[PDB]
């Protein structure tokens, strides 16, 4: 932390934050019931 860091200048600044659109589109269930009720 001074002025110029050659061959770099991002990430170590504070990490660029990412925001979601909506978690609604994922994880409405895949495992209902005992999942697999019978195994041959």
């Amino acid at each position: 932390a001074n002025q110029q860091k050659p061959l770099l200048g991002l990430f170590a600044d504070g990490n660029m934050p990412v925001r979601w659109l909506g978690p609604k589109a994922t994880y409405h269930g895949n495992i209902d019931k005992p999942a697999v009720t019978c195994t041959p």
């Binding site: 110029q4 860091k5 050659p6 061959l7 770099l8 200048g9 991002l10 990430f11 170590a12 990490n15 660029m16 934050p17 990412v18 925001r19 979601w20 659109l21 978690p23 609604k24 994922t26 994880y27 409405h28 269930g29 895949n30 495992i31 999942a35």
Partner: protein, 155 residues
């Protein structure tokens, strides 16, 4: 057709790979008696390390946490590292390259390594949306590029 292009960023990839992979499911049997609607949070951390002259490894740690409060659905994390050679320029010019373009190269690989871990925990697969970091830099400045020839004659 007569113009000397010189020191314009000379970018080339050496090797892309997963430096680290991880998955957790502490409430894995418990998820049966859980409501399937988590507050999924993206938690990313980004590092860089010089391996050689103009050679910088960009690390893109992505963590997908799914929890409907304290009630955790699943946890997944990948540290997608890529050996990138960015030569000629530095500072704000290279900040556009490493801070925008390099994550976009690691992002598809990070994504599939996350999705695979979610699917291994037999949970509904999560495909991460196209997040263009470079678009923000494109509105600002330093978007100016066009390949040519580097020197390396100034220590």
């Amino acid at each position: 057709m007569s113009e000397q292009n010189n020191t314009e960023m000379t970018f080339q990839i050496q090797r892309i790979y997963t430096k680290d992979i991880s998955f957790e499911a502490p409430n894995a049997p418990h998820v049966f008696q859980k409501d399937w609607q988590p507050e999924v949070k993206l938690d990313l951390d980004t590092a860089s390390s010089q391996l050689a002259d103009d050679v910088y490894e960009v690390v893109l740690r992505v963590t997908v946490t799914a929890s409907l409060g304290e009630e955790t659905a699943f946890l997944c994390e990948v540290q997608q590292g890529g050996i990138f050679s960015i030569a000629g320029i530095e500072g704000t010019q290279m900040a556009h390259c490493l801070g925008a373009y390099c994550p976009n190269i690691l992002f598809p690989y990070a994504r599939e390594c996350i999705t695979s871990m979610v699917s291994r925990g037999t949970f509904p697969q999560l495909n991460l949306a196209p997040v263009n970091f470079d678009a923000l830099f494109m509105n600002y400045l330093q978007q100016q590029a066009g390949e040519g020839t580097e020197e390396h004659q100034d220590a």
